[PDB]
Amino acid sequence: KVYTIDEAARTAKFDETVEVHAKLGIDPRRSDQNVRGTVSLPHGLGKQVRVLAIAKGEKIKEAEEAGADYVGGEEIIQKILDAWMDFVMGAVGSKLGRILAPRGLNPKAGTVGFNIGEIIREIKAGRIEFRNDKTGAIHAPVGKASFPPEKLADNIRAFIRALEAHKPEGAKGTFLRSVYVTTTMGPSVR
Amino acid sequence: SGKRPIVANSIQRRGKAKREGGVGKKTTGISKRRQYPNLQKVRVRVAGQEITFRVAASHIPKVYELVERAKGLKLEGLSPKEIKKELL
Amino acid sequence: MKVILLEPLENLGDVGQVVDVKPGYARNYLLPRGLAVLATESNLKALEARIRAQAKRLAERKAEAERLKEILENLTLTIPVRAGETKIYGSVTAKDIAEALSRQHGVTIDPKRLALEKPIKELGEYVLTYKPHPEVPIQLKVSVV
RNA sequence: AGAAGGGGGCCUGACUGCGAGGCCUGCAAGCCGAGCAGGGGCGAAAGCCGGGCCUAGUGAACCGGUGGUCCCGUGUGGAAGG
RNA sequence: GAGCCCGGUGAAAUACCACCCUGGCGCGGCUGGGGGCCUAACCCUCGGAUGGGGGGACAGCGCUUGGCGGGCAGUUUGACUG
RNA sequence: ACAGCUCUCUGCGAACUCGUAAGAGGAGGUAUAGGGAGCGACGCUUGCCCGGUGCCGGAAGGUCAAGGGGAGGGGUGCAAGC
RNA sequence: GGGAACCUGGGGAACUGAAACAUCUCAGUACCCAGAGGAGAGGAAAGAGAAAUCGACUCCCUGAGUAGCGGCGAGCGAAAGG
RNA sequence: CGCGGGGUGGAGCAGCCUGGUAGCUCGUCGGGCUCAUAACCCGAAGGUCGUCGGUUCAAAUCCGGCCCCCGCAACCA
Ligand SMILES: [Mg+2]
Ligand SMILES: [Mg+2]
Ligand SMILES: [Mg+2]
Ligand SMILES: [Mg+2]
Ligand SMILES: [Mg+2]
Ligand SMILES: [Mg+2]
Ligand SMILES: [Mg+2]
Ligand SMILES: [Mg+2]
Ligand SMILES: [Mg+2]
Ligand SMILES: [Mg+2]
Ligand SMILES: [Mg+2]
Ligand SMILES: [Mg+2]
Ligand SMILES: [Mg+2]
Ligand SMILES: [Mg+2]
Ligand SMILES: [Mg+2]
Ligand SMILES: [Mg+2]
Ligand SMILES: [Mg+2]
Ligand SMILES: [Mg+2]
Ligand SMILES: [Mg+2]
Ligand SMILES: [Mg+2]
Ligand SMILES: [Mg+2]
Ligand SMILES: [Mg+2]
Ligand SMILES: [Mg+2]
Ligand SMILES: [Mg+2]
Ligand SMILES: [Mg+2]
Ligand SMILES: [Mg+2]
Ligand SMILES: [Mg+2]
Ligand SMILES: [Mg+2]
Ligand SMILES: [Mg+2]
Ligand SMILES: [Mg+2]
Ligand SMILES: [Mg+2]
Ligand SMILES: [Mg+2]
Ligand SMILES: [Mg+2]
Ligand SMILES: [Mg+2]
Ligand SMILES: [Mg+2]
Ligand SMILES: [Mg+2]
Ligand SMILES: [Mg+2]
Ligand SMILES: [Mg+2]
Numbered sequence: 079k080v081y082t083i084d085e086a087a088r089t090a091k092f093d094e095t096v097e098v099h100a101k102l103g104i105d106p107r108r109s110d111q112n113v114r115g116t117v118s119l120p121h122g123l124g125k126q127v128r129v130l131a132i133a134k135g136e137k138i139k140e141a142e143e144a145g146a147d148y149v150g151g152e153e154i155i156q157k158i159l160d161a162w163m164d165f166v167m168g169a170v171g172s173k174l175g176r177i178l179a180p181r182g183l184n185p186k187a188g189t190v191g192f193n194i195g196e197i198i199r200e201i202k203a204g205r206i207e208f209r210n211d212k213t214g215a216i217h218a219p220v221g222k223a224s225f226p227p228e229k230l231a232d233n234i235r236a237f238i239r240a241l242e243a244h245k246p247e248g249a250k251g252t253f254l255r256s257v258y259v260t261t262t263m264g265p266s267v268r
Numbered sequence: 269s270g271k272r273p274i275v276a277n278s279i280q281r282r283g284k285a286k287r288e289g290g291v292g293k294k295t296t297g298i299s300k301r302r303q304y305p306n307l308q309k310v311r312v313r314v315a316g317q318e319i320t321f322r323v324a325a326s327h328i329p330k331v332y333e334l335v336e337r338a339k340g341l342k343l344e345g346l347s348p349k350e351i352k353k354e355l356l
Numbered sequence: 357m358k359v360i361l362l363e364p365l366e367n368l369g370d371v372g373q374v375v376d377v378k379p380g381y382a383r384n385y386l387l388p389r390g391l392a393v394l395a396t397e398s399n400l401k402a403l404e405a406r407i408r409a410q411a412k413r414l415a416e417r418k419a420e421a422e423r424l425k426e427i428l429e430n431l432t433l434t435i436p437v438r439a440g441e442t443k444i445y446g447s448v449t450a451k452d453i454a455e456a457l458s459r460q461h462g463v464t465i466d467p468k469r470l471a472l473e474k475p476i477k478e479l480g481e482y483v484l485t486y487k488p489h490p491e492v493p494i495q496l497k498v499s500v501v
Numbered sequence: 502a503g504a505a506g507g508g509g510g511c512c513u514g515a516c517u518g519c520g521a522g523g524c525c526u527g528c529a530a531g532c533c534g535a536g537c538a539g540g541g542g543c544g545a546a547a548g549c550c551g552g553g554c555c556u557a558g559u560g561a562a563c564c565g566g567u568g569g570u571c572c573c574g575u576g577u578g579g580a581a582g583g
Numbered sequence: 584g585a586g587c588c589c590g591g592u593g594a595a596a597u598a599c600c601a602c603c604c605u606g607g608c609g610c611g612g613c614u615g616g617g618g619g620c621c622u623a624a625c626c627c628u629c630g631g632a633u634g635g636g637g638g639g640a641c642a643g644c645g646c647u648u649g650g651c652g653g654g655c656a657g658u659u660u661g662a663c664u665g
Numbered sequence: 666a667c668a669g670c671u672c673u674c675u676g677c678g679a680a681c682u683c684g685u686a687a688g689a690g691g692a693g694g695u696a697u698a699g700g701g702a703g704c705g706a707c708g709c710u711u712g713c714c715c716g717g718u719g720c721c722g723g724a725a726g727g728u729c730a731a732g733g734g735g736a737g738g739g740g741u742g743c744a745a746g747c
Numbered sequence: 748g749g750g751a752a753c754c755u756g757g758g759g760a761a762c763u764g765a766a767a768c769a770u771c772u773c774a775g776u777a778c779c780c781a782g783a784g785g786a787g788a789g790g791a792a793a794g795a796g797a798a799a800u801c802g803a804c805u806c807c808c809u810g811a812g813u814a815g816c817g818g819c820g821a822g823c824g825a826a827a828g829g
Numbered sequence: 830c831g832c833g834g835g836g837u838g839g840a841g842c843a844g845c846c847u848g849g850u851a852g853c854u855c856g857u858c859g860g861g862c863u864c865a866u867a868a869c870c871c872g873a874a875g876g877u878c879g880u881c882g883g884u885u886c887a888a889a890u891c892c893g894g895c896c897c898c899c900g901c902a903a904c905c906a
């Protein structure tokens with residue numbers, strides 16, 4: 079309505095269920111649905127999202143403080159990847175196709191925050207404070223969101239999942255949306 | 269063929285193309301002849317007392333307007349050219 | 357095809373109304389059997405005022421009831437009803453009620469549209485009303501000698 | 502055959518720009534082609550390579566079709582169309 | 584996404600709100616095709632009818648679509664050549 | 666040409682013909698009738714082939730003109746739009 | 748009703764030409780019919796066309812055999828402006 | 830050039846668009862039927878599901894790209 083009504087997400091418990099559902103065209107020729115990997119997202123979030131950096135057993139004093147809370151090392155190569163209830167989740171960059179204990183034994187893998195300057199500094203931002211959403215087939219849409227408390231200052235669901243419309247080829251015209259969930263879902267234009 | 273509030277008619281031709289496209293390749297018309305678009309007729313009775321009309325077709329209503337009169341008219345049998353000559 | 361109607365017809369019968377139809381129905385049935393007429397702004401405007409020149413033409417049988425209400429209401433009647441106690445003698449026909457209003461205050465009386473069902477024929481107090489629609493109930497009193 | 506033939510190695514000059522000068526010739530067509538410039542192939546090199554030992558293996562313009570480029574673009578702009 | 588569940592395990596976990604592929608039903612729109620009855624346009628009729636019979640949105644007629652169409656028309660049916 | 670035979674068309678505003686039409690023949694007729702076709706009194710007869718052609722019959726499918734239909738695309742304007 | 752041609756409207760050929768011929772040409776000519784009259788039509792902008800322009804209409808001379816039209820054949824052929 | 834339909838045991842047909850497990854038919858051959866035969870009855874092996882590879886955990890198959898096949902197509906200087 080009018081703009082993109084944020085506080086439209088109002089009972090349940092701790093309202094933290096806003097969404098960004100919107101369709102478009104399937105696979106117009108080549109491409110499809112590839113939102114920005116861990117986009118900035120104009121939200122301080124507060125999401126103490128326990129992110130893991132499977133870097134090394136030498137980065138366990140600041141890799142933990144690398145924006146999340148708990149981060150192990152390479153002892154998760156054959157000690158933690160053998161079961162069905164035992165086997166975020168990072169990996170190794172550069173070119174190392176290190177997909178042995180994390181590719182079959184799948185939860186999150188592509189590349190780790192290219193920050194060899196430090197695993198946790200005061201100049202590096204976005205490693206445990208960003209989101210994404212690849213494809214979804216004959217049922218796309220859906221993005222991340224914060225809590226209920228946020229005036230016309232929670233305009234992050236109208237810039238990361240609504241501007242992430244740069245991975246759309248040609249063959250149709252995107253349309254129909256709604257920002258909400260666990261409550262309902264009202265729609266907003268562009 | 270007549271007209272009433274309308275008019276006689278035209279006798280335009282009938283071109284005949286075994287053409288192509290110009291929006292494809294070339295194109296041409298084999299021939300044409302003198303047609304006869306017989307100005308769409310039709311007749312309407314109606315009443316001022318009980319009159320007859322070979323109304324145009326387009327102007328069909330038109331009559332019905334002329335209908336809506338009442339100018340003190342009696343035994344004429346005709347009584348139409350009496351609406352017409354005072355018609356638009 | 358806009359047209360005014362007449363003899364209320366089903367689907368479209370709110371007399372003197374406006375309804376669209378296929379030229380045929382009008383031009384052949386409705387129109388011929390004087391049950392409606394062409395949208396003719398003429399018969400349209402003329403009709404229009406055949407309403408306002410009636411709406412307030414009858415809205416006088418209601419307007420001159422408010423001038424008669426703010427008067428026949430309070431001001432009672434007080435009839436010299438020649439009676440005396442028990443079962444009165446000469447019942448109160450409006451030929452007397454109106455006769456003791458018209459032929460008393462020089463005011464319009466309607467010895468019928470008065471709400472009188474029967475002559476009473478006994479002394480007491482009443483408050484019948486002036487008919488029909490909005491009504492002015494004259495409070496009428498009875499007396500003796 | 503003192504190769505145009507038989508075999509091997511790299512290559513794509515079966516190029517773009519042009520063309521002095523001829524052959525043949527009624528016109529229009531057809532025919533060989535030195536050499537300059539451009540960037541290339543093979544070679545140590547002098548050099549050769551603008552298709553095929555050689556003559557047949559094809560069809561004026563008109564009309565449309567696809568590509569592109571600078572030009573035109575009906576008051577001007579851009580388009581529709583040349 | 585956790586009060587209105589995980590679990591264990593598998594390609595994927597459910598209590599709930601959603602955006603939508605698959606697909607049918609539920610009251611409306613806009614349009615369609617059909618099969619019925621009608622009469623009043625159009626048609627035909629009846630000892631002369633302001634009417635009565637029967638046909639009836641059909642037929643007939645205007646425009647436009649495609650086809651059949653020597654019934655008729657204009658034409659074409661090469662040149663060399665003892 | 667002929668009587669006579671046969672196939673065939675035609676339900677009456679008949680089919681068919683003349684005519685742009687109105688109208689008229691048909692016929693003031695109504696299938697024991699009217700038109701078209703071939704054969705040609707009368708006697709005995711008239712075989713086989715429905716692949717191709719024509720015509721009669723097939724409320725299924727194939728193809729198909731408008732028109733309806735609008736997924737999708739292009740032109741322009743800052744735009745609502747056109 | 749008449750009237751030598753002359754004018755306007757309504758209709759409206761073919762031979763020819765293209766060295767055949769069907770678009771095309773001849774040609775809106777011939778001729779037919781109506782009508783107007785000493786003439787007829789046309790006539791005061793819902794124009795023209797690129798000029799800060801022009802200013803009813805009709806006739807002549809140029810524009811110009813240009814622009815264009817065209818089985819881009821034969822051939823046809825303006826207008827503004829002066 | 831436009832559209833859009835089919836490769837499946839030897840042959841000629843379903844199946845997949847809802848993936849998930851390849852089945853009709855006829856024949857090949859061996860028994861059962863008489864002396865034998867066609868009518869017949871039964872048991873059988875026989876496909877990298879056209880491929881270059883895109884998806885899915887997994888394709889005969891879901892959607893494209895490709896060699897014929899196959900019908901509608903509209904001209905043709
Ligand atoms: Mg979709
Ligand atoms: Mg286990
Ligand atoms: Mg042709
Ligand atoms: Mg032509
Ligand atoms: Mg001609
Ligand atoms: Mg109309
Ligand atoms: Mg009049
Ligand atoms: Mg007028
Ligand atoms: Mg070589
Ligand atoms: Mg030469
Ligand atoms: Mg050279
Ligand atoms: Mg060569
Ligand atoms: Mg030519
Ligand atoms: Mg041509
Ligand atoms: Mg322009
Ligand atoms: Mg539980
Ligand atoms: Mg749906
Ligand atoms: Mg509906
Ligand atoms: Mg009837
Ligand atoms: Mg009737
Ligand atoms: Mg009809
Ligand atoms: Mg002939
Ligand atoms: Mg010839
Ligand atoms: Mg000879
Ligand atoms: Mg017959
Ligand atoms: Mg007769
Ligand atoms: Mg004979
Ligand atoms: Mg015999
Ligand atoms: Mg046969
Ligand atoms: Mg047959
Ligand atoms: Mg049939
Ligand atoms: Mg269509
Ligand atoms: Mg727009
Ligand atoms: Mg005269
Ligand atoms: Mg000719
Ligand atoms: Mg010629
Ligand atoms: Mg010719
Ligand atoms: Mg010709």
Ligand SMILES: [Mg+2]
Pocket residue numbers: 786
């Ligand atoms: Mg003079």
Ligand SMILES: [Mg+2]
Pocket residue numbers: none
């Ligand atoms: Mg004059």
Ligand SMILES: [Mg+2]
Pocket residue numbers: none
């Ligand atoms: Mg004026």
Ligand SMILES: [Mg+2]
Pocket residue numbers: 806807
């Ligand atoms: Mg002069």
Ligand SMILES: [Mg+2]
Pocket residue numbers: none
């Ligand atoms: Mg001049």
Ligand SMILES: [Mg+2]
Pocket residue numbers: none
């Ligand atoms: Mg000159």
Ligand SMILES: [Mg+2]
Pocket residue numbers: none
């Ligand atoms: Mg001039």
Ligand SMILES: [Mg+2]
Pocket residue numbers: 835836
């Ligand atoms: Mg297939």
Ligand SMILES: [Mg+2]
Pocket residue numbers: none
């Ligand atoms: Mg098949």
Ligand SMILES: [Mg+2]
Pocket residue numbers: 836
């Ligand atoms: Mg095959």
Ligand SMILES: [Mg+2]
Pocket residue numbers: 837
């Ligand atoms: Mg097969």
Ligand SMILES: [Mg+2]
Pocket residue numbers: 846
């Ligand atoms: Mg599907």
Ligand SMILES: [Mg+2]
Pocket residue numbers: none
């Ligand atoms: Mg079987």
Ligand SMILES: [Mg+2]
Pocket residue numbers: 855856
């Ligand atoms: Mg078998």
Ligand SMILES: [Mg+2]
Pocket residue numbers: none
């Ligand atoms: Mg056998």
Ligand SMILES: [Mg+2]
Pocket residue numbers: none
């Ligand atoms: Mg067998």
